[PDB]
Design a protein around this ligand. Structure first.
Ligand SMILES: NS(=O)(=O)c1ccccc1OC(F)F
Ligand SMILES: NS(=O)(=O)c1ccccc1OC(F)F
Lengths: 263, 264
């Protein structure tokens, strides 16, 4: 991949692999979300990084607060998908990373995503607003004018998600992460939580519908030795409300919604 | 990727991804085994397929009986790895698929693998010898002279694996596959079983050693709604382990294997 002409966004092409596709011989949403993460990392590498000089001295990291993916067409096995990604400052709240997924043959937009990121101290895990010093450093890598993947004011990407109330309609209990679910820093990958959310959707929905929209709020990380319960309730196309919580005390780790279309 | 000049082997280059690497910033053995599977599939596609005309008419499929991976150097995140793969007939027993992993910059061999495949009826799950009619159809895609990734007289790839006896030294109880662990035909991916085997190795071994050799025998398939227990016992400067995968309930064997680890 490479940075675009203006050096304010990064493009990369991926060939869809045999093991990355589902029953429909098209890429799963977890494969897509893994590709978005990879193109995000390559953009950080190409511009010099993933934290700023001041962030390293202050022991601060970027953590995901929310992920919103919208797919119109999942790429088939062997197809080439092209993803363009960019970052933008959101004042002192944090940073937003957006993506556009395109068909490499037609050039049509097949999907789009947006994510919200906040600053946190590696140790202590305290949320802190973005400093004036750590702002000047990365603003040179972001476009100055707003460039939104979801320009619609008050759309699905910015809707507040409610808490699922017991009893849930569907459930998947006792989910545990394995070594492959960890990243290079031995933390659970943000993509595993997507897989866990979807585990409680009935197989009959998965077989008869396609995932169109997925919005996921991150509240607490799942440790290597933690166990998770995945809960789902229909709120409706098919709409669902999801809750990820610890098998024991029931401490919330994630909340979200999914929208599915009949095939 | 592309087939080589003679049309008897397939080469492909992969850039190592951020999510594909472990704590050491090098590709995990599950990422490697996934790449071997992908290059295997692209070889089947390039030559016209992953079953022959006769195999589809008789509802027969190719199933893995054994996998043997040996890694000298795991590629780093961002490095380009090049894999060459080929198939060879083993008479009526079945087919063997071999791989060579190379560093794309130096051209040095960083790893190698071999796997044994048998014919099975997709519906009855009954195994069978390869008929001559099937053998004539795919022999045109295989080299005629033997081309072994593991030439050695006394090689690790062909050693019989014993059954782990209880009590195991280490264990990882209640492992269940999730949707991402399934392939396009809703069967558990052969690579997930590698991850499950390794789950019972203590984290202290993983942190202080590197996986050099892994041999895994496939006996039974894990269904979507099956639960697995992963057992490990040390059998040994190097560390050797004996592994057993079995169903949490009745204890029906699904896999058996060995791993060899060296100090970092
Ligand atoms: N290092 S990074 O991944 O956070 C990054 C990459 C490209 C542009 C900006 C940016 O950081 C900004 F959000 F602070
Ligand atoms: N089994 S397969 O269809 O994946 C295949 C791929 C390339 C060459 C031969 C071949 O068949 C036979 F050698 F087993």
């Amino acid at each position: 991949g490479s940075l675009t002409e203006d050096g304010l966004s990064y493009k990369e092409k991926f060939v869809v692999r045999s093991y990355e596709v589902g029953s429909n011989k098209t890429a799963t949403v977890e494969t897509i979300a893994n590709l978005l993460q990879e193109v995000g990392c390559n953009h950080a590498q190409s511009v010099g990084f993933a934290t700023t000089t001041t962030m390293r001295k202050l022991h601060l990291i970027w953590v995901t607060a929310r992920m919103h993916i919208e797919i119109y067409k999942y790429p088939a096995w062997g197809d080439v998908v092209e993803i363009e990604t960019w970052c933008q400052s959101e004042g002192r709240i944090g940073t937003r990373r957006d993506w556009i997924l395109k068909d490499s043959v037609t050039g049509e937009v097949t999907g789009r995503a947006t994510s919200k990121w906040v600053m946190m101290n590696q140790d202590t895990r305290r949320l802190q607003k973005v400093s004036d010093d750590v702002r000047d450093e990365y603003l040179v890598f972001c476009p100055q004018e707003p460039r939104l993947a979801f320009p619609e004011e008050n759309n699905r990407s910015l809707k507040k998600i409610p808490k699922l109330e017991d009893p849930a309609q569907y459930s998947m209990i006792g989910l545990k992460p394995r070594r492959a679910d960890l990243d290079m820093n031995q933390h659970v990958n943000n993509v595993t939580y997507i897989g866990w959310v979807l585990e409680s959707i009935p197989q009959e929905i998965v077989d008869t519908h396609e995932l169109q929209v997925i919005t996921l709020d991150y509240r607490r990380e799942c440790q290597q030795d933690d166990v998770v319960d995945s809960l789902t309730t229909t709120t409706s196309d098919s709409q669902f409300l999801h809750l990820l919580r610890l098998s024991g005390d029931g401490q919330e780790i994630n909340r979200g919604t999914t929208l599915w279309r009949k095939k």
